[PDB]
Structures are given as C-alpha cells and as structure tokens.
Amino acid sequence: EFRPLTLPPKLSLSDFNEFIQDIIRIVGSENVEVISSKIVDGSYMKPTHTHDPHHVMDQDYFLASAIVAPRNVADVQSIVGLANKFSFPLWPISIGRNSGYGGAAPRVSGSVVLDMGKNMNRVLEVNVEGAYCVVEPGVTYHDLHNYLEANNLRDKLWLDVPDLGGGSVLGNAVERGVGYTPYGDHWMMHSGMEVVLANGELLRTGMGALPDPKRPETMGLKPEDQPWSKIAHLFPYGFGPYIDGLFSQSNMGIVTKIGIWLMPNPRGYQSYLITLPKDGDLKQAVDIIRPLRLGMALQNVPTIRHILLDAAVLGDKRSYSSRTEPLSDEELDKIAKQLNLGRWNFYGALYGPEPIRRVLWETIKDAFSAIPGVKFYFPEDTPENSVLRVRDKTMQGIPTYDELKWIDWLPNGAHLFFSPIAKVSGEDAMMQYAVTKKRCQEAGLDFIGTFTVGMREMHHIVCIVFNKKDLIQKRKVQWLMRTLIDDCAANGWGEFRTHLAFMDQIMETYNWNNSSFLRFNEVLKNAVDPNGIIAPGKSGVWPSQYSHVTWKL
Amino acid sequence: EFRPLTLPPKLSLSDFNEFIQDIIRIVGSENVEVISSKDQIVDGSYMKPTHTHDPHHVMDQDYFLASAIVAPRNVADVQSIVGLANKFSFPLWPISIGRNSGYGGAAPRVSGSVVLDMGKNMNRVLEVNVEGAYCVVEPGVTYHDLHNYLEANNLRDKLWLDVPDLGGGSVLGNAVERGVGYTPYGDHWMMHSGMEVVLANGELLRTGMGALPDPKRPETMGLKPEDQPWSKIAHLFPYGFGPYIDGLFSQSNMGIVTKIGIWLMPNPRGYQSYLITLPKDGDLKQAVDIIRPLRLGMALQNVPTIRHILLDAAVLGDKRSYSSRTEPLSDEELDKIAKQLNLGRWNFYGALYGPEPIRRVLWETIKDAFSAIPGVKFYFPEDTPENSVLRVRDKTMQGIPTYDELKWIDWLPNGAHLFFSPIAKVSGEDAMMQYAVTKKRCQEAGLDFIGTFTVGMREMHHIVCIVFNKKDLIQKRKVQWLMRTLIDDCAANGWGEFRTHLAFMDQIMETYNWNNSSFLRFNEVLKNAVDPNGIIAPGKSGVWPSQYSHVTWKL
Amino acid sequence: EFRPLTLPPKLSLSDFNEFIQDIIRIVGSENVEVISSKDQIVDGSYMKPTHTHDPHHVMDQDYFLASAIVAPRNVADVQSIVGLANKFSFPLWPISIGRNSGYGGAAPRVSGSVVLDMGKNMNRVLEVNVEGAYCVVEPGVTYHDLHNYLEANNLRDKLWLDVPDLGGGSVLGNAVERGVGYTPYGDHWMMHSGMEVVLANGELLRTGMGALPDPKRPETMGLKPEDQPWSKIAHLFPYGFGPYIDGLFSQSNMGIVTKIGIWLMPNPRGYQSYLITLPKDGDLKQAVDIIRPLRLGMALQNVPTIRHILLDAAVLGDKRSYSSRTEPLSDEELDKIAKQLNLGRWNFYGALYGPEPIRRVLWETIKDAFSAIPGVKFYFPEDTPENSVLRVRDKTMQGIPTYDELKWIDWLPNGAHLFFSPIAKVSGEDAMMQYAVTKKRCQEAGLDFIGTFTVGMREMHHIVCIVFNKKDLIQKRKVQWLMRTLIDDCAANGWGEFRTHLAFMDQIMETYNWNNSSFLRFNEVLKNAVDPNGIIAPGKSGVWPSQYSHVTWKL
Ligand SMILES: *Cc1cc2c(cc1C)nc1c(=O)[nH]c(=O)nc-1n2C[C@H](O)[C@H](O)[C@H](O)COP(=O)(O)OP(=O)(O)OC[C@H]1O[C@@H](n2cnc3c(N)ncnc32)[C@H](O)[C@@H]1O
Ligand SMILES: *Cc1cc2c(cc1C)nc1c(=O)[nH]c(=O)nc-1n2C[C@H](O)[C@H](O)[C@H](O)COP(=O)(O)OP(=O)(O)OC[C@H]1O[C@@H](n2cnc3c(N)ncnc32)[C@H](O)[C@@H]1O
Ligand SMILES: *Cc1cc2c(cc1C)nc1c(=O)[nH]c(=O)nc-1n2C[C@H](O)[C@H](O)[C@H](O)COP(=O)(O)OP(=O)(O)OC[C@H]1O[C@@H](n2cnc3c(N)ncnc32)[C@H](O)[C@@H]1O
C-alpha cells in the first residue's frame, strides 16, 4: 500500500496511498494488490490482471497502478464513491481473458483494475421452464457448463461457448461476443441486467425495473440481494427507453448481474465439415451460403476457416516449415493435402429431430455440390485429433481449450484481432480477403483468419499471430493493424470489436456527419459520470476531463 | 394563424404567432393547420385519422390537444423546426402516421404541443435490397405502402413482410414503439438495423453501422447529410462499434426518427396457416403448457396467437347482433357463441413456413402435441367459411395488410379501443391467474373481456382489448378505474406492461420503481443531457424533463 | 426590407427587420440591398461582381448566400454595425472588392450572413510616400485604382506596383489573403507594414508601429481615431514592440481590416521580361532543378512562373477553337497546340530588373543554366506576336494591371474557375510527382489539366486551374470529387494547400491536424476570446466559434 509503478493523471502519491488504504480497509488486503515490482504475462490458467498479456504496444504501456477485488456489490458502491472523491479512474473486468483485445489492461495507465469476478462468481439462478440463467461476472463458460453437469441439466438446456471455455459469460456478452450454436449472438440473448452507475446507485434494466412483489421472506434485503420479477429475464425490453445497449462496449456503468437465454436441447444434433479444395472457392462458397443462412438451413453461426487456422491448432509453424518468410500458395496446398482438408474448410451443424436434419443436410450437400471437388464429413469420418471433433463440442456448448494452440504458431505466441464486417457476398468477402492478405504478406505474416456468418453479415476475424520477444515484428504488426483499419473503412467495412491500442482510430472510422455518433456518446458519458471515473477511453469515448490532444492514439 | 384552442405551458399568444409565422415561412401554409376551433376536434376514422387529439378518448375528448399540426417537407425543415422550438421552448410531439389508436392516437402528452407530422411528406421507400433481405423507409411508409411497392416490383416471390393486425400503421412508427407482427419477423424492433435521427439540438445522427460513412465517390458529392447513401453494412448488422444506442430512441423522447432499416423475411418456399380450436374456457392452461416447449424448440415458427372467442366473434358482429343485453355476456352464453361459429372458447392461430417435407414434420408434432386436449379440432384456411378469421390471419401471417380486424372496435355503440398490455410467463398457471385477475375486473367494471395472448419466445404479450362506448361518460370513468386498477393488480403479481396510452404512461412507469425509481431517474438524467430545453415529447413514457413539474403534470 | 431568401442561424424574421431597420438608419438605403428574390442571385461578371453568392459555383449556386449587402460609409459605421450584429448575434462576412472568384467570390460561409461591402465607400488611397517607398490604402482601392493614382501623379518613374494576374483585385484584400504578385514584391503579405482593424467588440486597433501614436500637434486635433495620422515608422517597420499580432488577421476571422500599409518597389532603373520555352512535358523536372539554385541565389529576382501549355493556349482561345472534343486532350494533341503557338509543353516567364550591366550578367547566367535542356528557345517581348502571353506578362511583371488572363476561364462553355493550390519543394522529383498525382486525377474526372508553378524562395505554389462548365451538374460533382480527393492525395504526400474555396475550407484545415488538431483548437481558443458572439465570418479557414455546431456546419 505505498509506491506504484505508475499513477493515474494529475494525482499525488499522498492521494493514491490515502485511497488504497481506505480500500485495503473496505475489502481487506487479501483483495488488494498494488503494482510495485518491475508485471508478468501469465497464462490462460492464471491470467495477469496488470497489463496486456499479448502486448503489441510496449509491455508496460497499459499498466494498472493496482488491482482491487470487491467481495460483493456494496464494496463496488463504496469503491466508486471513493473513486469519485479522488477522481481515480477505474477499469472493470469480469475474468480478464479478453486477450487479443488487451486482456485486463486499462486504457488509462494508473487505473485500478476492478476484478469483479474473483469473488462475485455465483451462478445465481438456472431456470429450466424459462430456459435462462442469471450470472455474476465470475461465472466462466466451463463453470456454467459444470453447473449444468452437476444437476443433470444438458438433457434439457445447452450453452453457447466461444472458441475457449475460460471467458466470462457476463463479460463476453457485454463486448458482444460470439459463439457457434443458434444462440451465437450473445448480447442478443440477454435479458435483465444489474448495474452500478458512476454515482454508486444500483440500476436494474428491462423488466428488472419492475420490482418483485413485497413479501415476508424477501423483506429487508438490500437492493443487490433482492430477487427479480418473474418476467425480468424472459422479456428484454420493459417499458420506455430500452437502455440495455448503453452498457455494451461502453464505460457507462459496472455490470454486476445479467440474464442469458439458454437454448434448450435440440432433441438431435450432428456437426459437419465441408472442405473446399481451392483458395478461389471462397467467392462461390459465400454465394451459396447467403440464401442458406437467410433461409435458416444453416441454423447455427457457421464458420469458414482458412487452412492455416486449422493447421495451427494441429502444430506450430516450425513443425510445418523451417522458413522465416511467409508460406506460399503452393506450400499451403500441400498442408491441405497433409491434413485431408481444403484451402478453406466450412464447419457447421444440424439441430433438431432426425427427419428435419435429413432435409437440411440433403440441401446443404447438393447446394455445396456446385463447387468442384467438394467433400463432406461427420465427426466419425475424421481423424481422432481432427478439428471437427473439437468443434463438435463447441457447436453444442461443451467448452474446450484446444483452440488456444494456434497462438503458438510462432514462438512467444501473442494474438491480435482485426475483425471487420462484410456482406454475405462472395464478391465482398473476396475483395476483403485480398486487402487483408496483401497487408499481411507486406508485413511478413502468414494470413490466418475465419469468416464467421451471422444472418446478413460476416464477421471476418483475422488472426494475427506474432513473436512478442521480436521487437521488429511488433512494430510492423502495429502498422498492419493501423493500415488495415484505414483500408477497410475505405471500402465501407467497419470493425465490431478491438484491442485497446486501436479504439481511438476505429471510433474515428465511425465519423459520419463530422463524428456525430461520438459527440452524442460524449454527451451521454459526461451526463452519467461527471467525474470521468469509469473506464475513460473505452471505445474511444473520453469524458470531458481528458483532452483529446494528449490522449487520442 | 392567430387564436388556437390551447397553448403550451409558459408561453404567450404573441410568441405562438411569432413561432408559427416563422414556420409557415419554412414548411408553407399547406403544411400547417392551427387548431383554432371546436370544429377541428372531430374523432374521424381509421381511413382518415385525426391528428389533433385522442380519437379513442378515455379522458375528456379534448384533454390531450394540439395547438397546431406541422408537416415538415424534409429533414432540413425538422432541423429548422427543432432549432425554432428550442428558441421558443415549444414542445413537439412527433408522429409518423398517427394510427396509435388504443394508445392515444396522434395526441401529445402536453396539451398545446405541435404534432409534427413526419409522414405527410417523408413517405418514400428509400431502398429495397434483395440480397441483404432488407428495406429502408421514411416515417410515412405504411404497411400497405411497403406491400404495394413489393407488388409493383414483382418481389413477393423473393421477400415477405411482417404486419400487425391492421395494415395502415407506419413501418417506422410501429418499430420504434416495438409493435408486434405475426410471421417469424414479428418483433418489429429486433428486426431493425441502422437508423437516422434528428436530436433535440438539431444535429443529425445515424446509429449502428450508419455511423461508418459510405466512402466518397463522384456521384454522391455535395449531398445534404439526410440525402447521403449509407455504408454497405448499415442495415446488415445493427451494433457497429461502441455503445449500442439504438434503444434510446424506442418508446422515448430522445430524438425524432427520420429513417430506419428493417429486415424482411425471405419468401419461405412454402406456407400453411392453421387454426386449432380449444373447446372449454379452462383449456387455456393446458394449451399454454403445450405451447411453451414448441415455441422454445421452434416447432412454432411464427408469433402464434391465442384468441378469446369474443375477439373472433367481435370481428364477425357488434354486440347487438348477438344479445341485445346491457351486462357482460355470461360464461353460459360465451359457449353458444362458440358453438354458433364452430369455434373454441379459446382459438389458436398460427402458420408453418418452409419446404413441405419440413412443414409436414412440424405439423405432425404440433397436431399430436395439442391432441392431448379433449375436443381439439384442426383447420386450414380451406376448411372454414369465407367470412372466417383464419382467412384473414392466413393473409396476416404471410405479411399481407388487411383491415378486417377493425370491426371488433364496433362491439359497442360509439366504440373505441384501449389496450392494457401486461406480459406473462409461457406457463398455464401464470396465464390463467393473469386471465382470472383481468376477467374479474372486467366484470367488476361491466365490460366484456376481450383479449389475446401473443406468444413471444419466453414470454407472452397478453393484449386486453377494452372496447367502450365513447359517448358513455359513466363507462369511461369505469374504464379508467379498470385500467388504473389492473396496472396495480398485475404489478402486485409481477407482470409489467410493455406499451400504453398517454393517460396511463406515468402510472405504468411508476411500477418500474425498483430501488426508489432508479430506472426513471437515470432516463431523466439522459433526457436532460440531450434535450436541455425539454422540446421533444415531454412526458412520453413518464419521462419529464426538468422544466415540467412532476407534481403538476403526472397522473 | 422584409422577406429575404435565407436567414442566418438561430434568428427570427422579426429580428432581421429590427436589425436592418437600425442599419438602413445608419448607412442609408443606398448602402443596403436585401436579397429578397431569385432575381438577385445572378452570377454576373468580373467587371460587375455579384456580392451575394459564389459566381463560380461548384456547390448549388445558392448554397453560399447572403441575407443582405451593407456598404458602410466609413469606420464609425463599422464600429456601429459590429455593435449591432453583436446585439442581434448576426454573423457578418467582410469583403474589400469581392473578386475572390475561384475561392468563393463574395459569398459568406454561413448562409444568411451580411456581406459587409468595405470597399464601396472606403476606397481612398490615403497616402503615397516616395522616400519611404510605400502606400496606404483603404479596402476598395483596386490595383487598377492604385495604378491610375500613380499615373495621375507622374510617379511611375519613381515607384512600381506588384500585381496579381488580374488588375481588379483589392490591394488590401489580396494582401490579407496572401495573394501572389510577380515582381520582387510578389509576396503581398510580407510587403505590408502597419494595419488598422475593427475588432468583434467594436474597438479600433492599429498594429506594428501604428500603436505608437503620431505626436499631438495643432492640425490633428479632435480627429476621430480612424481619421488620425500615423507615426513616422508605422509603415517603415512592421514589428513594433511586443507580440507581432499582424498574422492573426490574415486568412482569419479575428477582425475587419480598415486600412493597410504596403511597400512599393522603387523603379528599378532598367527592366527586361523574358520567356523560355521548355519543349517536352518531362522537361519540368530538369527545369525546376535549374530554377532552385538561381532563385536561392537571387539570379531570378521576381516571382517567375512555369506555365502549362494549356494555360497560355486557353488565354488565346476556348476549347472549341482547338478540338471540338469532349474528353481531355491527349499528350499527342498537347504537343500540336504547342507547335501551333511556338511554345513549349511548359513555358517559363520571368523578368530581369536593375541597371543593364547587372541585368546582362544575370541573363548570361540564366541563359547558360537553362541551355542544359534540349530544345530551349529564349524570347523577349519584342520577339513574339502581338497577341502573345509574354507581352501581357511583360506588363504584369512591372506592375501594370491587365485583364487578358480572364479569357482562360472560358476554356469550357459557362466556364468558371476553382483553384486547388498545393505547395511544393523546389525539386524536380517533387514537382513531377505532384504533377503526376494532379494530372492523373484530372483525367480520372475528365478535366484538362491546366496549371502553373509560381516559385517562391524555397517553395513553389502549384496553382491548379480547374475550369468547369457551371451548368453541367455532373461535372460539378466530378470537380468536387476531384478537389476532395486531391486534398487527401497531396496531404498523403506531405503537400499543404495555402488558400481555398469556402466549400473546401474545413477539409483543408483538417489536414493541419498535427497532434490531434492542435493548431485549430488554439485558433479556436483565440477566436472565442476576441469574438465571444461569433459575429465575424464564422467558418472562415475552418475556424468556428463555439455557438456553431462542428457536427452541423463542417464539410
Ligand atoms: C485468444 C483468443 C481469444 C478469443 C477466441 C480465441 C482465441 C484463441 N475466440 C473467441 C470467440 O470465438 N468469440 C469471442 O467472442 N471471443 C473470442 N476471443 C476473445 C476472448 O477469448 C473472449 O471474448 C472472452 O470470453 C472475453 O474475455 P473475458 O470474458 O475474460 O472478458 P473481460 O476482460 O472480463 O471483459 C472485457 C471488457 O469488457 C468490459 N467489461 C467486462 N466486464 C465488465 C463489467 N462487469 N462491467 C463493465 N464492463 C465490463 C471491459 O471493457 C473489459 O475489459
Ligand atoms: C385499433 C387497433 C390497433 C392495433 C391493433 C388492432 C386494432 C384493432 N393491432 C395491433 C397489433 O397487432 N400490433 C401492434 O403492434 N399494434 C396494434 N395496434 C396499435 C396500432 O395500430 C399500431 O401499433 C400502429 O402501427 C401504430 O400507429 P402508427 O404506425 O401510426 O404509429 P404512430 O401513431 O405514427 O406513432 C406512435 C408513437 O411513436 C412515436 N413516433 C412515431 N414516429 C416517430 C418519429 N419519427 N420520431 C420519434 N417518435 C416517433 C411517438 O411516440 C408516437 O406517439
Ligand atoms: C479568376 C482568377 C483569379 C485569380 C487569378 C487569375 C484568375 C483568372 N490570378 C491570381 C493571382 O495571380 N494571384 C492571386 O493572389 N490571386 C489570383 N486570383 C484570385 C483573385 O482574383 C485575387 O486573389 C483577388 O485579388 C482577390 O479578390 P479581392 O481582392 O476582391 O478580395 P476579396 O474577395 O474582396 O477578399 C477575399 C477575402 O478576404 C477577406 N477580406 C477582404 N477584405 C477584408 C477586410 N477588410 N477585413 C477582413 N477580411 C477581409 C475575406 O475573408 C474575404 O472573403
């Protein structure tokens, strides 16, 4: 509780010590860790909460003065009123496995990272008839999966998981994360949420604003402990202004609870793989997809994975090639052959009773048969190490950590995400792939990515892997991402999600009518948090105390 | 114009004229009607909606009243009018079409406001994109309009609509209200992406991927913001980057909406409407229970509906065609009406979509499922008389605008509807309790219960169709009592209301008072941030800006 | 007057009339024209400049539009008008003569502003001092005016002017814009000392040694500030003591300039104009390289110029006199035009000044220097046909106003110019790259490249002469695209623009965004300090005072 590496802006060593003393008294020093020593990157099992584990900037560039971990909601309210008093900026995390996007690191160096999930980790409710659950920030996907297994529940309810099962359900959902079942759109499938505002008051959204009737057993409970109205997590909208969205990808409050819809057991499942021989086959693949996914033949969020993405799960670059320079079109085709895979590979799944799956499979099979050399497999038709057998788990909400392995492609693996949005049009996908690829090869990187598919849009997750001891390769990775953002905005593709180092540049792409969108958000931001306390800079939304000349990247 | 019926608060007749002078000089005289006489406050009809007051008046006819009507030509005029309203601190009340009958019509909350008719002159279908399966509309594009525009382009073989019970509504307007359709695309609000707004400060704003600008190119140069094209992804993906602000402008007074992107369902390549009659009054409980898993599993694809017998019977006749009885029809009489029309006491309407192998399976499932109920009969449109409700809902559940549902408003003489719209769990017990509360209060007030459960995913909108004689000033007072009581009864049992009439907005938002009205105090902070002068629709959804006395204006 | 075409922001028609009433009562009716009809927005000519809108309109003709024209008699009226504009918060847009065609003409940035015609009635040459070699002028003193005044006093044997390409411009006006002449005294702004200004607060101010007051004496008593004489050193030495503030009032909206002191070159005692033809398109690279050291060494005394063949050819004829071709002339055709007129593809115009022993040496140097190029031919005015451009520039490079250059605006039917004016290093490679960017975009838009490098000391102003048919609404949109693209291309290669049209002011200042628009945020702080009410020319050079929404008004 004395001397930290960095402090937040305009702030005296007296004040920090005075602040963190009061905190160390509120939550006990078990739950306080001041950052005093010259900050290790940590693992997925025990993630760092100090700085960016997959640093593309300098390692120390995003740096927490401390880490606080409240026991409950009250302590959050207390910490905030203290933050307000000292004009001490916060940075909420749920779990802090948001690697690829900066992890648990704050934008403003000197901030407290508020580890919400360390203690607040209860699966508050799983509800079978409403087909929902209510979770705190500390509930991971494996955790929630576990809860279902210990109560014999996957007979009745399945999850939706991102590629790894370690993320926060709460946390992923407010970043508008994505999965790969029919409930892949995580933000969409929320209903009812609790929030500590910058002023310390508790606000519950949607039908959660309708209080549960007064009665003997719940009488005298604190707000944070009060139960929800019956409809709270069944109907997202409530009455009047639908505000829920003000707390997604924002710095408008601290989220303490949330309802998530769970898809009930289909009563029949079957994943599949479709390999696409040629690199050119993508255009035609996306054109066939468009009306299949619009039609609800492709019921889940399906995904077109580049060859190197599959290859990188199975081994590192070394295990394929000894070369420094990026792999050629010829060498990729060999790997395709070495694995019994296409230059692109379409993973997907069927849901519901046998006769329905029969009709959609028939059509998907003949639909795709339009492409020369196409082939079809189920899990059983593939090698026991094959990716399909992993994604077979993913696409029914069984968590896996197998997908982590492609980070190791290069030694000292870090990922960085460039994630623009395209039309579900072969022409658009290809013109975007070609922009991405051009810049990757200029930057000396192997192109790795997916095109994942929503209803009418395609998230093109580009998977930038780099050696983080290699200071040259970072410098040009930084160039790659800054160039690709400016490029894709020059063909009308925006990014839906990013890393801390780019939130300013990306928000500047969204500058229709002289940055009208951002100007409106600032007004909202400064309205609800006068003292600029909560996560300044998040999504490039700066409160009025942060001058845009010192602080915009 | 010189001498209006009411003025808005804190404002002199000299100022109204200076204000309307400067406005007739912007929009033109054609586009301004000033309500200067009791000739102008006439209820009119659905085909010609009054734009001055509540046509379906539960309060005094003239309680909610406009000083004047102003039909902006285009978005610039709105920017201009907002700027002027700010200068004169003149409250505005935006509408798109103004058929929000049952929830106040076109009337403003604050008497003396300008009803800003957004759809008189902003009524173009700006875009229909087939490969994206979406359209872009300005405020005045009705359902029948958008529908016609599809027929005029031989597009229905590719794209279908989603319609509410009546085809005259604004696509734009209903969406922001979160109205309810009856195909898969029924949640009209969900099915939006990218929308344009004039703020209280006059600035133009586009949400989602609208904020990403369509790249410069020669043919788009020198265009006024409102007339610029959109990005590739504006209407393909609603979130964009950063805070998702779209919800701030649904059921709110934070902006004036100029354009919206709406998704359209593609033509399913096969369709089959159907009706399942549920014999006894009590068959509702078992029915909901059967409906729950099939909706959750997506065996029920559309937004199906469970229609109380009087709803269907009111479509086919007014009350005096059935009883010539003053009091509300007995249980014993409700059955004879049902036997007379070959209907159940509850009636379940629904549609199957897709290729016929798939539809057949889903029908096998639904039919076997419902067969658990004693007496159940199934029908396709084909199997019922021409006048039947199913042939209307056959059209409704594949996006075709109709107007047949109007008839039920004439249940009583001088008939007007009012909707009390509480939400419920998809649970027989919960559905039945709510119904029991509702029905008991309807008897207590001397009204025939009429209503419908529209089944969302995890959730039912129980629409309660209050039909009253609007010349009967004793019935109004009972209706008001009925509404104010039911809000409290249903709040006392944990059911919220998703949508209301102007007169009940403040009471309804008073039920959302978890943690000492925390949700309202937050919306108030936001409102005052973005509309310092309280120009836009003060009192919409209980949200009063700081100039309005909560003591004086709440109800 | 009662009903103008546009009004300024946030302002009622009642206020405009109260404001113009009080003004007709100050200046007089003769000095106020109110733009109340579409008869008044006529482009007119160079000899009679419209003072209401952009005569050379790339936007809609009426995008930039005045509410009214006001011709103050004298400095008091300005103090009065400023005071009143402040009271009514009425934006003003000062002009001296209003021939800023190619950069917006006399139009204001904010539609509805008062164009304040400073040179109608303040047009005296206040002083010509021979021993100091300087003059003092009010706003309305054109070049031809000042020139005539020298002939009327048999002064040319002692003092010469410096003129831009056209003699109708304001000496005052061009200087504050930093226009460019073509003798040694070409940097018109450099060549100023001591200037008088009315501030936004009404107070009168004199810069440099103007702030040192001319000592009291009997014949100067009781004079109104504006009519007081100046100090000995006011116009001999520009700095004075303390902060040098003169730059705050060039290309800015910080003041209204009432008087300026300008230095005049003495008669050199010998002069010789000349033209050097550079045969091939590519001879530009070698040429610049030769020009660099000779300019730096002062072997090239004046501001010489490198004129693209079409510039000279456009002076001699419109496009239909050469091709009757829609598309832009090919490289192969540009050569035949050059052979037809005994000219190079580039053409270098220049002058030698001083006593003949000195001129001869400098010509020996220049001639030998340029001889490095294959094909080079030299000429004196004498050696060319009467119609030639050199006889015009012979007059231009010794201060004589002409109007022959006007012809090139008629290259196309309904022709209007627009200047894109990026800066470059005096380096062949850099000159050539910039030219390659510019030319490529001109082809991409379907325009003939026409342009000129005017060589400063270390620096070249590459003036790009965009001629377009102003009735062709497809070409305007291409021109706009051309301009907005080129700003970005040239910013992407480190070239800034020194001067622009109203429509491109905000984009251009957006390139000056080093350190998160630090230079603009500073100028904004200053602006708001000195003009709290945002009265003076809001939006000049991208500088918006705090009342204007940057969201709404930027382009
Ligand atoms: C490395 C990697 C990452 C990854 C992935 C595959 C690999 C190999 N696949 C992903 C996928 O398929 N889908 C997806 O959405 N993300 C994927 N990622 C990224 C990441 O693993 C996941 O998104 C992960 O679930 C996110 O991490 P976590 O859940 O730990 O999130 P967080 O750091 O706690 O939160 C991120 C930010 O959100 C704001 N935040 C979080 N909690 C709160 C609360 N309670 N209140 C207010 N704001 C909150 C903060 O801005 C925080 O930094
Ligand atoms: C009488 C009746 C009504 C009815 C119905 C059946 C009958 C017999 N069935 C309905 C149904 O199945 N589903 C449904 O959603 N509504 C149903 N109704 C009610 C009504 O007919 C419809 O909701 C109708 O579409 C709404 O009317 P309209 O489309 O005319 O909308 P509005 O009255 O113009 O707008 C209502 C409110 O919306 C806000 N608003 C509208 N436009 C704007 C803009 N541009 N900017 C800002 N706000 C806007 C205002 O709050 C306005 O008061
Ligand atoms: C069409 C054309 C234009 C042209 C040219 C050749 C042709 C064919 N060659 C030029 C050249 O060689 N050098 C040059 O500098 N300019 C050339 N031009 C452009 C134009 O003709 C001249 O620049 C001309 O002298 C400018 O017109 P004018 O002298 O009329 O100036 P203005 O329009 O009245 O003023 C322009 C702006 O200046 C500010 N201003 C002017 N007076 C005041 C006062 N008193 N106070 C405050 N500000 C003032 C305003 O910003 C005004 O908008």
Curated annotation (Swiss-Prot), chains B, C:
SUPFAM superfamilies: FAD-binding/transporter-associated domain-like, FAD-linked oxidases, C-terminal domain. The active site is at Y103, F498, R499. It comes from the Eukaryota. It catalyses: 4-hydroxy-3-methoxy-benzenemethanol + O2 = vanillin + H2O2. Induction: By 4-methoxybenzyl alcohols, anisyl and veratryl alcohols. Repressed by carbon catabolite. GO terms for molecular function: D-lactate dehydrogenase (cytochrome) activity; D-lactate dehydrogenase activity; FAD binding; vanillyl-alcohol oxidase activity. Coiled coil: none annotated. It is found in: Peroxisome; Cytoplasm. The modification Tele-8alpha-FAD histidine is found at H417. Optimum temperature is 38 degrees Celsius. Optimum pH is about 10. Its cofactor is FAD. One of its GO terms (cellular component) is peroxisome. Its EC number is 1.1.3.38. Residues 62-267 form the FAD-binding PCMH-type domain. Keywords: Cytoplasm, FAD, Flavoprotein, Methanol utilization, Oxidoreductase, Peroxisome. Its main location: other. The record marks D165 as: Important for the catalytic mechanism. InterPro entries: Cytok_DH_C_sf (IPR016170), FAD-bd_oxidored_4_C (IPR004113), FAD-bd_PCMH (IPR016166), FAD-bd_PCMH-like_sf (IPR036318), FAD-bd_PCMH_sub1 (IPR016167), FAD-bd_PCMH_sub2 (IPR016169), FAD-linked_Oxase-like_C (IPR016164), Oxid_FAD_bind_N (IPR006094). To bacterial flavocytochrome p-cresol methyl hydroxylase. Catalyzes the conversion of vanillin alcohol to vanillin, and also the conversion of a wide range of phenolic compounds bearing side chains of variable size at the para position of the aromatic ring. Crucial for the degradation of the secondary metabolites derived from the degradation of the lignin. Catalyzes besides the oxidation of 4-hydroxybenzyl alcohols, the oxidative deamination of 4-hydroxybenzylamines, the oxidative demethylation of 4-(methoxy-methyl)phenols and the oxidative hydration of 4-allylphenols. Most active with 4-allylphenols. Homooctamer (tetramer of tightly interacting dimers). This is Vanillyl-alcohol oxidase. It comes from Penicillium simplicissimum.
